[PDB]
Symmetry: D2
Subunit: 251 residues, 4 copies
């Protein structure tokens, strides 16, 4: 127990699915957690479902909102003390080829998936450096950050950007002895109530030519690698990509 | 000779350095070439320096300008007939860590380096598919698309995006039998009049801990791999990364 | 606590340094452990230093010895019951360029580093498949499995082989529902009594152009990622490379 | 024409398929070529089919034969003058999972695919360094050097080894100003009389879930990238992987 003793984590998109499992396991391991989401109705209920206000709170925020990031860090420090841990998990998807991607779809997906991760990473380094917190920025960077998908053009762009921008941040933090690590987590297909809402999606994702294990993962599969990366167990890991994909990228 | 017989190429940022060497070798191999740049004074002189208007022309264009891409394809087809070949070479750099990157710098660099490559790739697929041209989109994607640099945060983001968005486009074009290939070229440090304007830059780039060959490359090093990728010699290459870096990424 | 409840692990080269830290953390998390080494004098003392014979024992074995692998699996099952977990950690190094590598050095290093990992992986799949153990093969595959070192030619060959042979094994195990996962761990430079015996080694490894964190790791850094991979926490991870290198490969 | 003016190349397994296409294009571009194979009957006819003895000769050799490499370099220098160019192309395949691989199959495949490439690379550096030849070692390293195949365990081991051992050699040659470059070529599935002898193979390889272009390549696809890498056009490329796979590894 207590693998995140004393840690203070922000988890973007922490009210559902992968983000909620990360928040749940973070609280179970002794972190204080601020989860973000778009909808107070979902977010407040999610926080209460996991624990008490001394353990977990909700902050309504769109990760694309630059000024809101300031308010989010300030609210988390007011609630829990200085932030040690940021999981940039909030993301959206557009099911279009590059050929069929409208510029509106392109800009909207990059605002969340790329600007959001940039804004959170930049502010995280500024607020967490040089405080002896054992600080950790975990960027959600997808198997779509390693391989293309013909129907996820803008998503591929965003996840490749997060993958290599995270290495830049990791290096600067390491060279300057900031006590901040930056790593990416690369989920394969994960069962979420959302996947459950797309008829035939889980079966298509489970075909051996997609996921060799012949089934998709579960939110806890991503939560456990995030616990490792938030913990001081991973104090020599920075600038690295952690893939949990049932073998998708191995073939 | 004649390795690009009958090809019609657009080269963005083709008036200087790497882009001009690509344009020069493309014309030498029998392609018709439209080069783009920001400044008619530089661009018109560059085109005339390489060949006659039947071989090479200039089109003034900022790669971030979405509507200008339409005019650029229309001008190239009017001059030379249908476009077969696009080199997305235009790029800018910001020498900032992620921590120190202003949002203005972030948006300006992504407008050229990421939106520009998206706009050119999307329009290229639409205009070049299903015409039996042996069409080839060559995206400039940098060693900074493989490894971080602590002082090139936004540049790293842009080059990782180009790397994996190019794989998406390659796959969609391959699966749909579009007769369009999409590949990335990843230069290491290359001597340009620009590098020459930064005192100490070439020496720093030439240190064995950076470039193991102990010197930097020249624009022709990038021109020759682009000739291969534009030619029908590379008709089975798509979705691949071609690195020419004096060993930078091998260590 | 108890993250390896009920697991039965073999750790090759488990009597010193990285392997001993993996054995120590495995026992702390409730695994039964058989450690191997060449020297009974070191191995027996190492096992007793960690725990009781019901928790940890020593088996004298050179990982290059094909027939000894049979005896090692049989001894582990006799002591602890069916084997769930194999860490192929035993390795040797030759400090020669490819140019200067003698064929004797080549064959000796590949016998331990490649044949040993093959023999253990092959026998592990045969003995651990289809038993509902949540079986996990963790192959030690080095940052030298990603990048070259001019003075580690044969070592580079061995670690690249382990990296991609492990993906083959992972895929076959996944496609056949064997309940066996196969992953590689890629340490950067780690402080061991051995590194301590090479004057100037740790300082050279700690230079920012080598390890950006400006120091090398410790055996526990490798132990903690191995606990994750042995545990059921990583039940969706197979065919993946886990890098813990202080940023070595990120630049 | 004349892209390999004055080059003297050894191509192992140059009597059939990929190696013969590389030899053919090398001669067409002005190289003198020694091709190797196991069978004088095939090899002598192959050499005569391509050109005159001043252009191309055959040398009977198993790439696993260490002493024969000495005789091969000596014969090539006697025929053509000092060797500038080595293509380590000779290889064999075993269609077994790691689980099902016999130790005999393992040792036989590694003798050709790994020892052969080591022996040729080591001797190539020794004989070609510091002679101003613009020397180039091209190691055949397969898409099976990037991704696993559940039924090519030993082949995966060999191709991952070649991939990263080649980076070691490239770095040492670059750091020591040897005038020797070392790069790997990674074919996807290529139509050879051999593939033609395996009923259903080409169709299985052509499925969109394997090769997105929906067909396999031809030997000339590998010949053209080898011409680039042998030529002085690629004088800044070392330690790099060149993939020609119809999109296999992009998904
Ligand atoms: Mg409480
Ligand atoms: Mg003319
Ligand atoms: Mg590096
Ligand atoms: Mg006890
Ligand atoms: Mg003649
Ligand atoms: Mg794949």
């Amino acid at each position: 127990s207590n693998r995140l003793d004393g840690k203070v984590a922000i988890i973007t998109g922490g009210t559902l699915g992968i983000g909620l499992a990360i928040a749940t396991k973070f609280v179970e391991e002794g972190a204080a957690v601020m989860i973000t989401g778009r909808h107070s109705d979902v977010g407040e209920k999610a926080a209460k479902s996991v624990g008490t206000p001394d353990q977990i709170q909700f902050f309504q925020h769109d990760s694309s909102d630059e000024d809101g990031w300031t308010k989010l860090f300030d609210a988390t420090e007011k609630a829990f003390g200085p932030v040690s841990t940021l999981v940039n998990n909030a993301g959206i998807a557009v099911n279009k080829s590059v050929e069929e991607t409208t510029t509106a779809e392109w800009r909207k997906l990059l605002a969340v998936n790329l600007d959001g991760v940039f804004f959170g990473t930049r502010l995280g380094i500024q607020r967490m450096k040089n405080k002896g917190l054992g600080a950790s920025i975990i960027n959600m960077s997808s198997i779509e950050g390693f391989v293309g998908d013909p129907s996820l053009g803008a998503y591929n762009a965003s996840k490749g950007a997060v993958r290599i921008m995270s290495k830049s941040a990791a290096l600067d933090c390491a060279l300057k002895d900031y006590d901040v690590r930056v790593n990416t987590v690369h989920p394969g297909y994960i069962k979420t109530p959302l996947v459950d809402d797309l008829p035939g999606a889980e079966e298509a994702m489970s075909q051996r030519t997609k996921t060799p294990m012949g089934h998709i993962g579960e939110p806890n599969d991503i939560a456990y690698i995030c616990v490792y990366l938030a913990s001081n167990e991973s104090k020599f890991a920075t600038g690295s990509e952690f893939v949990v994909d049932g073998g998708y990228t191995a073939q």
